[PDB]
């Protein structure tokens, strides 16, 4: 029936988020915290 319609179509976001957030999301907080550490020193 409907098995090959959301399996890959759903896990695509799961595969992509690794390249997306890691260079995109956590980069913001990491750079901000590191810069605030620089001001702390």
């Amino acid at each position: 029936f409907y098995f090959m319609n959301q399996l890959t179509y759903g896990f695509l976001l799961m595969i992509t988020l690794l390249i997306l957030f890691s260079q995109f999301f956590l980069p913001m907080i990491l750079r901000l915290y590191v810069s605030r550490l620089f001001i702390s020193k």
């Binding site: 179509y9 759903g10 896990f11 695509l12 976001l13 799961m14 690794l18 957030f21 999301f25 605030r36």
Partner: protein, 224 residues
């Protein structure tokens, strides 16, 4: 076109925007709206370095910060009048469960390799008693998938589809009757309780999913 693409489109449009748009201009001050991430990410890192402590903390902590939000966002469709977290089917947890368990066995097989027979017996029960301990270690490894697979899924599915039962049954709490008064108006108050229950359960279940993932991963990433 396809309904599944439209379902995933909300994630594809929210994931980039909530960090590339909710912030004012990517400023370090932490906006009032940006206080949300400013509180969430630090608690996330606390557990990430905590639960996966050691040199294994940096191995996949970014993977944790990634994998945590996917299910939480996908289940966010629970409070709409026609709400659907993955069209009441949501085979997605199957994708994230057994594959991650096999990834744990690989972290025992790709990095730990042939030492993989030196983890199922945490403390003792030597050759005179090893098989009994392995008999439950196998069950634990098998069911760790189902503990994070469909568990948050069942919680979300029930907390959302309880509204269907609520509507179908108490359509006539007050619509057309002489019971529209204080007599039966208390039965219709369960819907908001179900909404609060689903809302708390989803977030707590996403956090628990992340924690269970970390607990399973560090067990096969640090052999005792």
């Amino acid at each position: 076109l396809t309904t599944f693409s439209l379902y995933t489109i909300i994630v594809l449009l929210v994931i980039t925007s909530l960090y590339t748009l909710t912030n004012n201009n990517n400023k370090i001050i932490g906006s009032r709206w940006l206080i949300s991430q400013e509180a969430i990410y630090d608690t996330i890192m606390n557990m990430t370095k905590g639960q996966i402590g050691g040199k294994n903390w940096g191995l996949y902590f970014p993977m944790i910060f990634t994998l945590f939000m996917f299910i939480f966002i996908a289940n966010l469709i629970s409070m709409i009048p026609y709400s659907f977290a993955l069209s009441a089917h949501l085979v997605f947890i199957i994708s994230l469960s057994i594959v991650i368990w096999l990834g744990n066995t690989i972290l025992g097989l790709y990095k730990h390799g042939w030492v993989f027979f030196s983890l199922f017996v945490p403390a003792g029960t030597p050759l005179p008693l090893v098989p009994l301990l392995v008999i439950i270690e196998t069950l634990s490894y098998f069911a760790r998938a189902i503990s994070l697979g469909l568990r948050l899924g069942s919680n979300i599915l029930a907390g959302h589809l309880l509204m269907v039962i609520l509507a179908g049954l108490t359509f006539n709490f007050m619509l057309i009757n002489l019971f529209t008064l204080v007599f039966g108006f208390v039965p219709l108050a369960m819907i908001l309780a179900i909404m609060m229950l689903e809302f708390a359960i989803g977030i707590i279940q996403g956090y628990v999913w992340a924690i269970l993932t970390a607990s399973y991963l560090k067990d096969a990433v640090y052999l005792h």
